[PDB]
Structure formats: C-alpha cells, structure tokens
C-alpha cells in the first residue's frame, strides 16, 4: 500500500476491534510522522491464539 | 501516560486513569482508557540492558 494519505480515524477511535496497539510506535498520534511503505497482511485466526 | 510534559524539578503523583478517545472514563476503565503505573520486570534471567 503505497502513495496514500492514511486517515486513521476509523482504525483508532471509531474502532470495533479487540486490540489496537503498536510496537515501538505510539498509536495515539501516529498521524504526524511517515514512512516509505506500509503493508497489510490478513489471516484467519481463532479468538484464543 | 500523561496529557502534557513535565516542567523541570517537578513531581506529580496522581493515580487517575488516562483517556485518549471519545469515552468519559471517570473512575471506571474501558476503551481508549488506561492505567498509568505499570511496573518493571527485573530478573536474573537477563543480560545487561
């Protein structure tokens, strides 16, 4: 996922997700820095593992 | 967690809970809401660092 402007509204505070926390990055004001590229992996894991 | 940075030679103990998002968290924890004082793990099963 390249050449974006990433609006993290629905991921952070409009969320319905079991967790939202990022290793080594403060997930509260992640808007005011950026990186070369960011990706998206998706797999199917049951609610214990 | 803290709303703002500290001033020099100041100390402040307040065991309130820290909110980020759109939820009033007064006395009760929940989503976008955390408890600040999380402790250390010091073991002799480690190296220097």
Curated annotation (Swiss-Prot), chain A:
Region feature Integrin-binding motif, mapped onto this chain: 46-48
Top-rank taxon, per record: Viruses
Effect of residue 11 to I: In strain: Omicron/XBB.1.5, Omicron/EG.5.1
The protein's assembly and partners: Binds to host ACE2. RBD also interacts with the N-linked glycan on 'Asn-90' of ACE2. Cleavage of S generates a polybasic C-terminal sequence on S1 that binds to host Neuropilin-1 (NRP1) and Neuropilin-2 (NRP2) receptors. Interacts with host integrin alpha-5/beta-1 (ITGA5:ITGB1) and with ACE2 in complex with integrin alpha-5/beta-1 (ITGA5:ITGB1). May interact via cytoplasmic c-terminus with M protein. May interact (via N-terminus) with host bilirubin and biliverdin, thereby preventing antibody binding to the SARS-CoV-2 spike NTD via an allosteric mechanism.
Protein purpose: Attaches the virion to the cell membrane by interacting with host receptor, initiating the infection. The major receptor is host ACE2. When S2/S2' has been cleaved, binding to the receptor triggers direct fusion at the cell membrane. When S2/S2' has not been cleaved, binding to the receptor results in internalization of the virus by endocytosis using host TFRC and GRM2 and leading to fusion of the virion membrane with the host endosomal membrane. Alternatively, may use NRP1/NRP2 and integrin as entry receptors.
Stated name of the protein: Spike protein S1
Shown part of the complete sequence: 358 to 406 of 1273
Curated annotation (Swiss-Prot), chain B:
Residue numbers spanned by region Receptor-binding motif: 1-49
Name of the protein in its database record: Spike protein S1
Impact after mutating residue 38 to R: In strain: Omicron/BA.1, Omicron/BA.2, Omicron/BA.2.12.1
Highest taxon of the lineage: Viruses
Its biological purpose: Attaches the virion to the cell membrane by interacting with host receptor, initiating the infection. The major receptor is host ACE2. When S2/S2' has been cleaved, binding to the receptor triggers direct fusion at the cell membrane. When S2/S2' has not been cleaved, binding to the receptor results in internalization of the virus by endocytosis using host TFRC and GRM2 and leading to fusion of the virion membrane with the host endosomal membrane. Alternatively, may use NRP1/NRP2 and integrin as entry receptors.
Boundaries of the shown chain within the full protein: 456 to 504 of 1273
Disulfide-linked positions: 25-33
Subunit-structure text: Binds to host ACE2. RBD also interacts with the N-linked glycan on 'Asn-90' of ACE2. Cleavage of S generates a polybasic C-terminal sequence on S1 that binds to host Neuropilin-1 (NRP1) and Neuropilin-2 (NRP2) receptors. Interacts with host integrin alpha-5/beta-1 (ITGA5:ITGB1) and with ACE2 in complex with integrin alpha-5/beta-1 (ITGA5:ITGB1). May interact via cytoplasmic c-terminus with M protein. May interact (via N-terminus) with host bilirubin and biliverdin, thereby preventing antibody binding to the SARS-CoV-2 spike NTD via an allosteric mechanism.
Impact reported for residue 31 to P: In strain: Omicron/XBB.1.5, Omicron/EG.5.1
Consequence recorded when altering residue 35 to S: In strain: Lambda/C.37, Omicron/BQ.1.1, Omicron/XBB.1.5, Omicron/EG.5.1
Region (Disordered) location: 1-35
Substitution effect: residue 46 to T: In strain: 19B/501T
Outcome reported for the amino acid change (mutating residue 43 to R): In strain: Omicron/BA.1, Omicron/BA.2, Omicron/BA.2.12.1, Omicron/BA.2.75, Omicron/BA.4, Omicron/BA.5, Omicron/BQ.1.1, Omicron/XBB.1.5, Omicron/EG.5.1
Effect of residue 29 to K: In strain: Beta/B.1.351, Eta/B.1.525, Theta/P.3, Iota/B.1.526, B.1.1.318, Gamma/P.1, Zeta/P.2 and Mu/B.1.621; May enhance affinity to human ACE2 receptor
Phenotypic consequence of residue 5 to K: In strain: Omicron/BA.2.75, Omicron/BQ.1.1, Omicron/XBB.1.5, Omicron/EG.5.1
Result of altering residue 1 to L: In strain: Omicron/EG.5.1
């Amino acid at each position: 996922i390249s050449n974006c402007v990433a609006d993290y509204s629905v991921l952070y505070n409009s969320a319905s997700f079991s967790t939202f926390k990022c290793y080594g990055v403060s997930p509260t004001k992640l808007n005011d820095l950026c990186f070369t590229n960011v990706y998206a992996d998706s797999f199917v894991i049951r609610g214990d593992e | 967690f803290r709303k703002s940075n500290l001033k020099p030679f100041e100390r402040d103990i307040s065991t309130e809970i820290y909110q980020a998002g759109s939820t009033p968290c007064n006395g009760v924890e929940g989503f976008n809401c955390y408890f600040p004082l999380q402790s250390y793990g010091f073991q002799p099963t480690n190296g220097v660092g």
